[PDB]
């Protein structure tokens, strides 16, 4: 390990990798592992130079907590998702709470349920249960031991909206109600100044009382006095009502207190902004043809806010986009939340790394015969791209 060891493959046990990554492999690596005929063969991942720069930052961040260390997430733009197969397993081995989500779009382009509400945020009861069930597979034994704060008890609505933001939707309804009821006091001049001021004072008294009686938020009365954060089993029991309120409660809880280092990795982040496959009546004439934007849903919105990374006093977030699901085009980075100083633009594989990749497949009995004479010839054909290299060599005998 170090600068001297760049572009090498690290062996991984088949059984150990599954336990460390219960959800699955990071990226499209599952398509390349099935090609190996041997079932007992190990899995190798190349150590690109982009991982060395990122790994060093995490080392200093852990030592400080025991303004020099970074306190914001990064962004990989341009093999951006290849590093995820080596950075996540390593961090998890160092007692780090890592949130794994390689396929966040599965909760937006599949069979589900939507229920409109006054808050204007659609919820998914069916997909809300799968988020916590998959996260607890490997992150267990730590959430239960972690305590729970008392300053963030129950200030979230059913759809995960804050109390202050949820009650604002009813401001218009209450505004007209008070205007019609003012005739009782308006109809009983005196100095032309105090008479008008006294009438206005009645509005303040009535508004204060109206903002605390009509609204009846649900303060998770099912659990009066919690003791931990992993002891919330009632969320898994009830799904029709208590599906989204508990999802946001854990999200807010992991910002205030600081006991353990955390990490969040969201892959394929370029397919969360575009429109979803849902249909509704929220279109702005011809903007969506009657479709629900992906960022307007509950689950996608939770992982579609990079400007909030500052509140993460425990850790930080990270995302990468390399697939061809949508044309990147200009891909404005300034109007999204990230800055120009936090974008890691990787490049194509160097000739040195290209040779190692070809030799790696030989040990796996993937290719038939790859003469050294044509080793450099194939570099110009595919251009050294990883996607074009594996596909070109797979179709043909290779070399």
């Amino acid at each position: 390990v170090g600068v001297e060891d760049v572009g090498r493959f690290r062996l991984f046990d088949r059984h150990r990798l599954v336990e460390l990554l219960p959800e699955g492999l990071a990226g499209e690596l599952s398509r390349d592992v099935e090609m190996i005929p041997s079932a007992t063969s190990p899995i190798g991942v190349m150590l690109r130079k982009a991982t060395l720069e990122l790994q060093m930052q995490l080392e200093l961040f852990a030592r400080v907590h025991a303004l020099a260390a970074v306190q914001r997430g990064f962004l990989l733009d341009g093999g951006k998702s290849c590093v995820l197969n080596y950075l996540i397993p390593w961090a998890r081995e160092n007692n780090w709470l890592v949130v794994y989500e390689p396929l966040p779009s599965r909760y937006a382009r599949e069979i589900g349920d939507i229920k409109r509400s006054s808050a204007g945020v659609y919820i998914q009861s069916s997909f809300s249960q799968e988020f916590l069930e998959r996260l607890g597979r490997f992150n267990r034994r730590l959430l239960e031991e972690l305590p729970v704060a008392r300053r963030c008890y129950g200030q979230a609505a059913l759809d995960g909206v804050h109390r202050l933001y949820a009650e604002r939707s009813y401001h218009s309804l209450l505004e007209k109600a008070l205007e019609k009821d003012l005739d009782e006091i308006r109809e009983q001049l005196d100095s032309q100044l105090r008479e008008e001021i006294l009438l206005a004072r009645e509005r303040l008294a009535l508004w204060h009382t109206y903002r605390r009686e009509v609204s009846i938020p649900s303060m998770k009365s099912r659990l009066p006095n919690p003791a931990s954060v992993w002891e919330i089993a009632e969320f898994g029991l009830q799904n029709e009502a208590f599906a989204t309120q508990a999802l946001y409660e854990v999200w807010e809880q992991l910002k205030k207190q600081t006991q353990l280092n955390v990490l969040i990795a969201v892959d394929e982040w370029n397919e969360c902004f575009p429109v979803s496959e849902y249909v509704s009546m929220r279109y702005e004439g011809t903007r969506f043809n009657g479709h629900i934007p992906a960022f307007h849903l509950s689950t996608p919105r939770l992982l579609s806010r990079f400007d909030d990374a500052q509140q993460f006093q425990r850790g930080l977030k990270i995302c990468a986009t390399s697939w061809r699901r949508s044309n990147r085009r200009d891909y404005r980075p300034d109007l999204l939340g990230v800055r120009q100083e936090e974008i890691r633009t990787v490049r194509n594989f160097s000739p040195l790394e290209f040779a190692n990749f070809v030799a790696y497949y030989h040990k796996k009995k993937i290719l038939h015969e790859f003469p050294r004479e044509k080793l450099d010839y194939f570099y110009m054909l595919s251009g050294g791209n990883g996607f074009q290299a594996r596909r070109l060599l797979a179709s043909l005998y290779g070399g």
Binding site: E284, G285, T286
Partner: protein
């Protein structure tokens, strides 16, 4: 492959706004001006009040309302069969922008005076 706008991602049907950030096609322009007819009539100051019934929101979604919108929108993109080669249709936003700005129609996003532009 079959993208909208071609290789150069052309857009000859949308109009930008100087204020805020919101764009819409010419199809929605007709509906916006008709819906906000009360503000336009009062701004200036029976034969004059002929389009009052069309201001209804539900009437536009009916069979009768659908035909009225299509009548005004002549589909400028469609033309004669001889209009080939250099004689190709251009962006009709030049005429639409003038009417939208002179009528002083408020923007759905923020209530403002004439702030539309070609884009």
């Amino acid at each position: 492959a079959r993208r909208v706008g071609g290789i150069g991602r052309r857009c000859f049907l949308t109009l930008h706004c100087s204020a805020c950030s919101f764009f819409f096609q010419t199809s929605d322009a007709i509906k916006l001006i008709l819906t906000q007819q009360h503000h336009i009539l009062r701004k200036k100051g029976a034969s004059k009040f002929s389009l009052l019934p069309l201001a209804d929101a539900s009437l536009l979604l009916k069979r009768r309302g659908a035909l009225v919108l299509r009548s005004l929108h002549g589909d400028p993109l469609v033309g004669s069969r001889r209009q080939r080669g250099e004689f190709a249709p251009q962006a009709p936003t030049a005429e639409m922008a003038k009417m939208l700005n002179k009528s002083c129609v408020p923007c759905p996003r923020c209530k403002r005076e004439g702030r539309w532009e070609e884009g």
